[PDB]
Paper text:
In yeast, the SPT-Orm-Tsc3 complex (SPOT) harbors an additional partner, the PI4P phosphatase Sac1 (SPOTS complex). Here, we solved the structure of the SPOTS complex at 3.3 Å resolution. Notably, the PI4P phosphatase Sac1 binds exclusively to the monomeric complex. Sac1 interacts with Lcb2 exclusively, and we do not observe a previously suggested interaction with Tsc3. We show that Sac1 specifically interacts with the N-terminus of the Lcb2 subunit and not with Tsc3, as suggested previously. A short C-terminal β-hairpin structure supports the interaction. The structure of Sac1 includes two transmembrane helices and an additional amphipathic helix. Interestingly, the deletion of the Sac1 C-terminus also caused increased levels of LCBs and ceramides, but less dramatic than the deletion of the entire gene. This suggests that Sac1 negatively regulates the activity of the SPT via its interaction with Lcb2 independent of its role in sterol metabolism. Since we do not observe any conformational changes in the active site between the SPOT complex and the SPOTS complex, the exact molecular mechanism of SPT activity regulation by Sac1 remains to be further investigated. Furthermore, we revealed the presence of several ergosterol molecules in the monomeric complexes, suggesting that the SPOTS complex is a regulatory junction to coordinate sphingolipid and sterol levels.
Serine palmitoyltransferase (SPT) is the rate-limiting enzyme in the synthesis of sphingolipids. It catalyzes the transfer of a palmitoyl group to L-serine, yielding 3-ketosphinganine (3-KS). SPT is highly conserved across species and consists of two large catalytic subunits (in yeast: Lcb1 and Lcb2) and interacts with a small regulatory subunit (in yeast: Tsc3). Here, we solved cryo-EM structures of the yeast SPOT complex in both monomeric and dimeric states and the monomeric SPOTS complex.
Residue numbers in the entry:
A (entry chain D): 3 to 71
B (entry chain E): 2 to 394, 397 to 463, 471 to 539, 562 to 617
C (entry chain B): 18 to 556
D (entry chain C): 1 to 561
E (entry chain A): 39 to 222
Amino acid sequence: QHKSSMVYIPTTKEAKRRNGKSEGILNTIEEVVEKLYWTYYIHLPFYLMASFDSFFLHVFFLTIFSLSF
Amino acid sequence: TGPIVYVQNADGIFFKLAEGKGTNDAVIHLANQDQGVRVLGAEEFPVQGEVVKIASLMGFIKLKLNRYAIIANTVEETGRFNGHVFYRVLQHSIVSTKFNSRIDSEEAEYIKLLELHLKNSTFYFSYTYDLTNSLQRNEKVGPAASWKTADERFFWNHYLTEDLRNFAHQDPRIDSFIQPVIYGYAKTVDAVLNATPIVLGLITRRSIFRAGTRYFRRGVDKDGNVGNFNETEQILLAENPESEKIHVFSFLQTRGSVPIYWAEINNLKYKPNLVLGENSLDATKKHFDQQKELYGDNYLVNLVNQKGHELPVKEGYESVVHALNDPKIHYVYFDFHHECRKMQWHRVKLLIDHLEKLGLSNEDFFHKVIDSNGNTVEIVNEQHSVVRTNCMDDRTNVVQSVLAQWVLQKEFESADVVATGSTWEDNAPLLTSYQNLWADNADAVSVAYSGTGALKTDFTLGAFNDFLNSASRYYQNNWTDGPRQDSYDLFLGGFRPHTASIKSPFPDRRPVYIQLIPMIICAALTVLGSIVLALSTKFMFKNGIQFVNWPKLVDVGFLVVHQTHDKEQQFKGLKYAQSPKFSKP
Amino acid sequence: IVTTSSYLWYYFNLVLTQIPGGQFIVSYIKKSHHDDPYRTTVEIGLILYGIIYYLSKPQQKKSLQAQKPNLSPQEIDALIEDWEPEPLVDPSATDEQSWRVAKTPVTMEMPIQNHITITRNNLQEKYTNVFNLASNNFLQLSATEPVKEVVKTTIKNYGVGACGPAGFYGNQDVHYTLEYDLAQFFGTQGSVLYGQDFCAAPSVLPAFTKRGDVIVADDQVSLPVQNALQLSRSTVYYFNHNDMNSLECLLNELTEQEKLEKLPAIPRKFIVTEGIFHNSGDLAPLPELTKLKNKYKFRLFVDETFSIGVLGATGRGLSEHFNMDRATAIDITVGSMATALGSTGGFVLGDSVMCLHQRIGSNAYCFSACLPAYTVTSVSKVLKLMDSNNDAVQTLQKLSKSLHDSFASDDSLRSYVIVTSSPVSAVLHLQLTPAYRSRKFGYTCEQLFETMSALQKKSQTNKFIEPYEEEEKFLQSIVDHALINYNVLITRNTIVLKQETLPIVPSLKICCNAAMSPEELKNACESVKQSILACCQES
Amino acid sequence: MSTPANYTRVPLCEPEELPDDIQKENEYGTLDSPGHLYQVKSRHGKPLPEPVVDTPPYYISLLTYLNYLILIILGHVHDFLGMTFQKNKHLDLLEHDGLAPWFSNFESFYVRRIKMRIDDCFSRPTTGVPGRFIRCIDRISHNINEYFTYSGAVYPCMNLSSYNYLGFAQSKGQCTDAALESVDKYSIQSGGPRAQIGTTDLHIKAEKLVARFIGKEDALVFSMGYGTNANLFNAFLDKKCLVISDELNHTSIRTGVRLSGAAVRTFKHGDMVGLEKLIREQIVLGQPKTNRPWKKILICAEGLFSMEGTLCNLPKLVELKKKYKCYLFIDEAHSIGAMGPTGRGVCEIFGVDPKDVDILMGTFTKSFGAAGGYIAADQWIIDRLRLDLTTVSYSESMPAPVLAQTISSLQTISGEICPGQGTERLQRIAFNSRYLRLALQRLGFIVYGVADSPVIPLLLYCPSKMPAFSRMMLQRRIAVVVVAYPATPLIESRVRFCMSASLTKEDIDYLLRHVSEVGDKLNLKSNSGKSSYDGKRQRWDIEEVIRRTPEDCKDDKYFVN
Amino acid sequence: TTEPVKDHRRRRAAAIISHVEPETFEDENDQQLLPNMNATWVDQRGAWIIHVVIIILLKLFYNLFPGVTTEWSWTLTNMTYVIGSYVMFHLIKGTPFDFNGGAYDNLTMWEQIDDETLYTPSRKFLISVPIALFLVSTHYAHYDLKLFSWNCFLTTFGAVVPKLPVTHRLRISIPGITGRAQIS
Ligand SMILES: CCCCCCCCCCCCCCCCCCCCCCCCCC(=O)N[C@@H](CO)[C@H](O)[C@H](O)CCCCCCCCCCCCCC
Ligand SMILES: CC(C)[C@@H](C)/C=C\[C@@H](C)[C@H]1CC[C@H]2C3=CC=C4C[C@@H](O)CC[C@]4(C)[C@H]3CC[C@]12C
Ligand SMILES: *Cc1c(COP(=O)(O)O)cnc(C)c1O
């Protein structure tokens, strides 16, 4: 009653803890960058588009942001 | 078998036998609605249309969507032997039922491959004489010519006439429509030696079970077939005024490649890499058994280059021939790297050195005495042994010409033309014709096999064209050998695009940064008119295997393809790697 | 010229009063833009129309039913209480047609085979060791040992049933393998599997046909094809049964009218038919249909169910019998696996684009569960066995020809019954001659069709016809006599009259399969002939 | 092997040989503690309170609208340019030599432009018996979701997408033994239509057992639920009748009503005032173009809706049909064995007498693991329908192994063949559903349901959030199913969880941890005060939830709906 | 001429001005069987502010260019909004997906909104938006006679007239450029 045939995938927190990469000095920057990138990426419809159109959309958004800055 | 007349019309194309009896003769119709081949009576031939004459019909081929007819328009005479006439195809054409429509890119690519194959080929055929056989097989069969008795090994247009055979299973009228052809050379010239007329001929045939394009097909497969397998015969006829009998002689020779497992992987270098497979015992045994059953005894002559690059195959070939331990198979070795300025007296030295192992008798040939009416009154002697040459990893042609010339003196002696003890090489123009015949045969076989021609001796200096040939061949081997092998496979019937599981193989699929290297190199070169260019060149020559043009229709033994992907199981590109079965020596 | 200006002047004056305050707005707009009349006129018009539109009330559309706004609530209550419904299903005629329920045979604890034991009428009567001539399996290839072993292994490995639709997770590898095997065997690019054969035709035809299309159908076809035609929602014409001149004339008329109409986009056209018919049991001519469809630019739909495993040298279908190619001759093919192959399900055969569209636009495929694994695996094994050897087809063809020759060469039955089947069909159909039916029951086919059509159009609740019931009783009497006096079982054609649309009459049928011996078949034929003569003799 | 990547073919996979215990653990997990079971109680005839729905902030919906507009514009531009300029590539959508194409480009717009881009997330080949661990085939999507290439490697994943509520999908048990014995005795072939030959004692026994189990007077058994619904309605309806049906009914019911030819009217889902007004108006108005009273009035309803996971108000419907002299028809396929104190269905949870409803429908494939369907009604109605129906006389019959499987499962649930197995399974599935629903609500997500429905829909709104989530679940070895705009409203997208009776508590904990991590990354948790009994927003730590939820899901005061 | 047993024939118009014919029993049942999905989303949550958001975003984007004057920015945003609204509502006739056998093959989206009921709140808002846009644009940006005339023409003939009840179920069949329009 304790054996099966599945392999379990550990979560990312436990993997990082096992690898001993919990130091904050670089992890804070990595987490901030990743969170900003995912927040920008998910809300826009980039998964349903193609590469050629996504390139132009990225360029347009970058131009608007830089000009408004 | 004769000239055909075809009529194009909005409902298809009709083929009729131009020369016949005028009685009820079959008319072949290529349907337009369903693209099918049917046989009809005489009355269905259209009247108002325009008739077009064609020399012969090759066959019909079915592509992905439509069906096409391959036609030979005009022919040219090459040689005449004993009344028979030999022909060479000069113009080709492809005919389709549809006047005009839209076709996909795959259909255009297939048409381009077929046209490419038809452009670079030389076919020969004869209406009466059968060229797919030799004099032995012709003598053992009746004096008629038909496709049933043809040899399947040199029957080049086999897959194309399949429909023309399916109806002809019980249909004699269809027999006149099937025409075998050969992929090789055929020529005959006449002369007078001593107030006697003689005609000297030469025929070269090529097998169909393997392919060409040099490096891609070498060694043997499981079935025992050997790449680059061809056959040569040197028939001769003589008339003697002092007597009545007409004399016919025959001599045969065979060429091939070493039966051991090996391959040469090509990269962006002048000399490719050599690899040797696993142990080979079943395939070699089957191949030698087939050769023994067909031609009889075998005498294996193995010319090799300097040890440095071609050494490993020599030991393997000696080991396998030792392990076979066959009394009927006999190995004779010869090795020349000291020849200077095309001086070949050591050829005669070797010929003296030969004949000691198993005693090649000059008596061993085909002799025929035929009357004025051509009834083949009586035979004299038959042939039972052949010599097999597997060299050049040029040389084979030089050896074969010398051996044939040596035998021809005994051939002349047996015909009571010249007395015993006299050399027939005294005449200059006769030997000039002989050399012009064999040099042209060598050029034909060289151009057919790999790229351009080869070094030519002719009669009696040319390092410029000789050097240019090497550069042209180096370019062609590395950048333009995909389509040639693809055309071979498509024409011979290896690849049949008749399944929904197989997708289009033409679009490029390697990763983008591999594709962008040549453009970067070109841009750096044209803005240079240097570190970036040096780095790009180093990267290009450090990964040569990814940049060589490979065949796509039919796989090769010595490669594997890996498919890369990201974390979300999406295709990115493919990479070429050396097969694990083959190993470095 | 002047009525327009007068009406324009009159119109806005009324809506000026209709708005609670309008004069202040008009005065303000006029004063603000007093310099130019253009701008103030445009502003006044736009603002006034916006305001008046905002202040209106909702208005429904005009439908078929008429409104009744002049009714007081007391009248509403009176009418609502006065309403009287009808019974869900009328029970008046239940007892009259009950005998057909009590005549159904029931097999007891044995597989359906040549020799069975049956009980009828709720275990009131029991007959043992009868000779079966009513089965609908022709090859009997699913009862051999190898297929049984394969089925047992598949059940042990996969389980009994699948638990999902084909959309998400209900599709496994064995289904793909079966599709590939069918496509390779029948010489077509693609095939699609369906859970039930009765729900294949009504589900595929509506997917490819829309309003404004033209469909030409045969004079007499089976009920599922009629249901598909009804759900098609497209123009439908009828041509005489197996009459090519009428078909050619109809196609000529349609083509001429369509060409003269000068229509921008050409519509979709079809020709719907089948192979061995279910009710008549005769063969359809393929080459003429192919020639006509190629000449007049039409597509072809064939619903062949009784011809997949009986026709052809090997058993590849109707196309093999005429020595043609299935890829080009027929456009859409509908088949079934329950009859000849010996397992439940159905399939549809055609090119790749049609299958790709069916996998999305077909209702019965998208919204239903997948077939169990063992049926698929057994069907694939049966296909391999059929490909290996073809003795069963030869035996079946010889038995069917021998059966047909016996009933169509006698002279004592020429004045009572007629045979409308075909020598190649595996099922034999017998009908009463029109003269005998007219002399006995006093009605004909045309009168019955007219009466049923009138009743269906009038939408009358009770549909009961006497002579048809009497004829059915007579045929059941013949069957019962044959079963009682002799141990032979035959069946009549079971149909529902109130659902049919095309003319039809009661008949009788005899089946066959490839596991019999000629002596038994001959004795059964003699017994059936004797029973028919004994029961149907005049006076 | 040097050919490029252009070979597409599903490979037949050999079975894996394992000991018996490992296989049994793969197919059906064992119980951890006796305290993980819950017993459901009857409602004692009380109408359903109005459902409470929750909403996200405005900017999410605004972003959804912008994304859909951009995608539609791009699709139209691509289609126009491609069709106008590059004719050769699109040969399948053009008129060739006087023949019209199979389909037009306008109708297939959404399939070609929107759904195709996500086409790898919908259809997935599997192998082996579908249990609590399902084996999947490894594949790579070439081009852009155009075709796939298989390397012949398999791996197991926890499944949440199979219709087995009570877990009878097993290969080693009493049901499989009965099926094998049936194959030994009866063959796998059927004689033909049930009206002429093909009726055995097994069919009669099954009909009697179903009639006894459901609680009605007599029943009939068919071979396909979709065919049953399609061909049932035309037997007793005409052009003079009226059918008032919900707007969320299954496709088969709509097909049957369309085939029958009767007049059709619809009413808003969950509204009884609208239904009463519609009935009162329709009775007065009468037939069209002649204004005569209707012959009869029928109402169609569904026991439980899969997408929404909400029950239907039965007592109000019974009251209305009794007051206004109407007829009622109930389809129940998702609640025939998984709901109720004993497992009878909707008629047991509400305390309604089974004699009040007229026709009951159901299918065996949802819970009992065998294909089929049945119809239950009174005596004279079945006597008439046995003769008036077309499926009985023209269609095939149901094979023997499926019938044996169905009979064995029914006897197991009824408590005859096995002593104490049905109650244990029912309690397991009830507890699993309650635990998952409460944990997901406490974490911060948005879910729909009735606090016991086996289906749990979790809402995703942005179009780009539905693919990635699914792919991430595949990376963690979990299988999920999502639905989109052509089936569900434009604003609301969702992922469906179909809880089974074979999963254990630890699997649910593992699922909760992974789902919490993924939702935190993707910004999916957006709750409000309307999804809590206190009325305040809650965002709990994972450890606290896993520690205190199991002991609190058994109380009935924590569930708002 | 043979008459079909069952006819469903699309008939084209034969005059310059025509009205789409009413429906029959079968078509009415097919239309009422299933709730339409093209016209349902108008009443949902957040489907009214999106027009204002689009207008503001377009104005801000067109103001970003360096050389454009205020008048041309207002004119360009007016053009864009009116053209988009007209193409979405009044040009495409049919359903992008497959409905019950093409029951809606003769009606645009505006005629499909709210099951053909008139004077519903959604119609009031949709007809009120363009007038407010035009009035604000004219008042805040000083125009000339030429630009003002063109703006009035565009707003009147592209946004308001198709919304009027008098043009409901109306087809114009020019015998030249415009093809004949289906009438039943
Ligand atoms: C230089 C001088 C000025 C140039 C002016 C011209 C510039 C470009 C003109 C662009 C015209 C075309 C743009 C509009 C096209 C609209 C969609 C075309 C297809 C219509 C049929 C689609 C059927 C789908 C059914 C459906 O439910 N769709 C819905 C969801 O799927 C529908 O898609 C959503 O609700 C979208 C919500 C939009 C909210 C209000 C939008 C109104 C404003 C439009 C302005 C256009 C601005 C362009 C940047
Ligand atoms: C100034 C211009 C720009 C426009 C907008 C002004 C007014 C338009 C809307 C007016 C002009 C004539 C009007 C008109 C004329 C006649 C009738 C017949 C009546 O039984 C119903 C109202 C109806 C149908 C109205 C509707 C509104 C119309 C069509
Ligand atoms: C799942 C479902 C079906 C499926 O029917 P089958 O014939 O078993 O495939 C039928 N009806 C409803 C309501 C369903 O939800």
